[PDB]
Each structure stands twice: as structure tokens, then as C-alpha cells.
Scaffold this active site. Structure first.
Site, PDB file in Angstrom:
ATOM      1  N   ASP A  38       0.834  -1.202   0.000  1.00 25.20           N
ATOM      2  CA  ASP A  38       0.000   0.000   0.000  1.00 25.20           C
ATOM      3  C   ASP A  38       0.869   1.253   0.000  1.00 25.20           C
ATOM      4  O   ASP A  38       1.352   1.673   1.056  1.00 25.20           O
ATOM      5  CB  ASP A  38      -0.903  -0.020   1.227  1.00 25.20           C
ATOM      6  CG  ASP A  38      -1.819   1.172   1.302  1.00 25.20           C
ATOM      7  OD1 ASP A  38      -1.909   1.909   0.303  1.00 25.20           O
ATOM      8  OD2 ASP A  38      -2.455   1.363   2.366  1.00 25.20           O
ATOM      9  N   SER A  88      -0.499  15.567 -12.116  1.00 24.38           N
ATOM     10  CA  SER A  88      -0.720  15.199 -13.503  1.00 24.38           C
ATOM     11  C   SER A  88      -0.950  16.460 -14.328  1.00 24.38           C
ATOM     12  O   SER A  88      -1.484  17.463 -13.844  1.00 24.38           O
ATOM     13  CB  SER A  88      -1.926  14.261 -13.599  1.00 24.38           C
ATOM     14  OG  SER A  88      -2.307  13.991 -14.939  1.00 24.38           O
TER      15      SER A  88
END
EC number: 3.4.23.22
Length: 330
Positions: A35, A199
Site C-alpha cells: 500500500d 498530472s
């Protein structure tokens, strides 16, 4: 040193991935959910409340000659999906794919919430976010990667998750045969303890690319792709009959649909998520309404590049003095 381990989807939907981990002496092998959105290595154990164990493999520290109680240490964690777990702490030897750390904090669960009990395939979590998020008190503990870093050939790990198929976690090296083209690296903020990056935009299907900054986290422990409501609405508007359902808890779409791809930007590079990766199947057994793999992050407070996005790429988690992320197509 290096390590290399195969990671395998837990079910036919890729709801999560499990990777075998050796703990203790002699080794006890548990299948952990790696994770990159959390920083605790915790396991089902001989200390877990018996009614909360249902098929998981347990760690038994009393059977490990290298286990030592970390006196006074406790841990307690709550995840973005509302699940939680807590317990006490041992140190022990932990190996992943041939890479060994001695003295790793292994957090033994005394209590787990119902969603963990109900998932027989996941024996615990191995956190790979920054150690500043580790919950052990009163002495915070380091992640497996942080403990291994100085010994690794290069201070990196990579995630290569498969679509409906096994993939690989590598530690200490970048497998240049595992991706196409070049790796594009992008800046990371560690201020929230995550692999947080920006992004450069998105496209839906064959549509034109929209240049827009989207701050979010690379999170292998989250199944889906969670993005701003504007972006998510633009995606689902291209699917006839798709709608946001308050009763189901997100966007659903007719199971008869063929989904468009979704592209996200990494600098000037582009990662394409095929439409099929966005299908999470019937909302309930036998339903013709299917659950979408791109969902709104509104209310979560952060955008999450979960498995839906990461499995479309070869992803480098670069733990150099200034961390960065790398993405390549594959």
C-alpha cells in the site's frame, strides 16, 4: 541488494493485489496488500480477536525465534474506506522477494474492522508511503522500504500491476525489459506523507487532451481512480446511460456498454487506461448495472491515482534524497 516478488489480484475484478512476505524464523509466509498510500506493516496474528479472523493466515510471534516485543508500543490506523485495525508491535526479520530487513516493526493486530475480517485473501498490509505517516506510538517506526533503502543497489521500488493478471514489485533496481519507451519522471511532494504529484491533464477516448493540473497520490492500496467531479463527469458523459447513483455510491453504467479509454498526463508523456480497466462489474450479483472504475474525489479531499491508473503503467517510486515518481507505458 535487490528483491523481486510477484503480486496477484485477489479476485476477478482486481479489487486488490497480494504479495507473499516472509516474517520471522522459521519463515511464516503471509500474503500482504502493498500500500503506497499508508506506512504501517500490520498483520493478522495469534493476538487478533478470534471472532475477527475468518480464513486469514496469522503471524504467531511466539513461534519466531527472532521476534521481540517492542515494549510499550501500540498502533491504530483508519483508512479512507472507513476500515481500521489496531494492536501491539514486534520487531522481526521480514523478507520480500529475496530482500531481507532485520528489526522491521511488525504491527500485530488485536482488532480489525469487519471489512478486513470479511476478506479472507488479505493477511495484512505492507505500507510503502513515507514513514512520517506510521502510526506506532510512542516511537514512530520506519517502513520496510525505508529500512531497506541504504542496502539497495538503487533507492527505488517499482510497481508493475497486472490487468486481470499477476504483476511484480521490485526493490532496488529498474527492470528495463518491463516497460516500453522511456520513463517520465515527475516531482513529488512529501508534505502529506504520500507519493503526491501533479498530472498535467487528461483525455477521454479519442478526444483532445485537456491541459490542466491535477494534484493527487499514487496509491497501490486504493482500487479505483478518484478525480475531480468535472473530469469524472466528462468521462461518463461519453457512456450512454451512465449516471451517478447516490444509492449505489458512485457512477454506474449499463453492463452492455463498451467503455472509452482514459488518458492521464505525466509531464509531456501520456498513460492510456484501456476502457476495459474501468469496468468493475455488476453492482450486485446478476445486475445489469455495472460499477465504474473512475469516480469522483469530491468529499475525499484528495485525488487518488489508484490501481485502475497505476496498472496501466510501469511506476517507479524513487526514494532518492529528493523523491520523484516515474511512469512508463508497458
Amino acid at each position: 541488494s535487490t528483491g523481486s516478488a510477484t503480486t496477484t489480484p485477489i479476485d476477478s475484478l482486481d479489487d486488490a493485489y497480494i504479495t507473499p512476505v516472509q516474517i520471522g524464523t522459521p519463515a511464516q509466509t503471509l500474503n500482504l496488500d502493498f500500500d503506497t498510500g499508508s506506512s504501517d506493516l500490520w498483520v493478522f496474528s495469534s493476538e487478533t480477536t478470534a471472532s475477527e479472523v475468518d480464513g486469514q493466515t496469522i503471524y504467531t510471534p511466539s513461534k519466531s525465534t527472532t521476534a521481540k516485543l517492542l515494549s510499550g508500543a501500540t498502533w491504530s490506523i483508519s483508512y479512507g474506506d472507513g476500515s481500521s485495525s489496531s494492536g501491539d508491535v514486534y520487531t522481526d526479520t521480514v523478507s520480500v522477494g529475496g530482500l531481507t530487513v532485520t528489526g522491521q516493526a511488525v504491527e500485530s493486530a488485536k482488532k480489525v474492522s469487519s471489512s478486513f475480517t470479511e476478506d479472507s485473501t488479505i493477511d495484512g498490509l505492507l505500507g510503502l508511503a513515507f514513514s512520517t505517516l506510521n502510526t506506532v506510538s510512542p516511537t514512530q517506526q520506519k517502513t520496510f522500504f525505508d529500512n531497506a533503502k541504504a542496502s539497495l543497489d538503487s533507492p527505488v521500488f517499482t510497481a508493475d500491476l497486472g490487468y486481470h493478471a499477476p504483476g511484480t514489485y521490485n526493490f532496488g533496481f529498474i527492470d528495463t525489459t518491463a516497460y516500453t519507451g522511456s520513463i517520465t519522471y515527475t516531482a513529488v511532494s512529501t508534505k502529506q506523507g504520500f507519493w503526491e504529484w501533479t498530472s498535467t491533464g487528461y483525455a477521454v477516448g479519442s478526444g483532445t487532451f485537456k491541459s490542466t493540473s491535477i494534484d493527487g497520490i499514487a496509491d497501490t492500496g486504493t482500487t479505483l481512480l478518484y478525480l475531480p467531479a468535472t473530469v469524472v463527469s466528462a468521462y461518463w458523459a461519453q457512456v450512454s446511460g451512465a449516471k451517478s447513483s447516490s444509492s449505489v455510491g458512485g457512477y454506474v453504467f449499463p453492463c452492455s456498454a463498451t467503455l472509452p479509454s482514459f488518458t492521464f498526463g505525466v509531464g509531456s508523456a501520456r498513460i492510456v487506461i484501456p476502457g476495459d480497466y474501468i469496468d468493475f462489474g455488476p453492482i450486485s450479483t446478476g445486475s445489469s448495472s455495472c460499477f465504474g472504475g473512475i469516480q469522483s474525489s469530491a468529499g475525499i479531499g484528495i485525488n487518488i491515482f489508484g490501481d485502475v491508473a497505476l496498472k496501466a503503467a510501469f511506476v517507479v517510486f524513487n526514494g532518492a534524497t529528493t523523491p520523484t515518481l516515474g511512469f512508463a507505458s508497458k
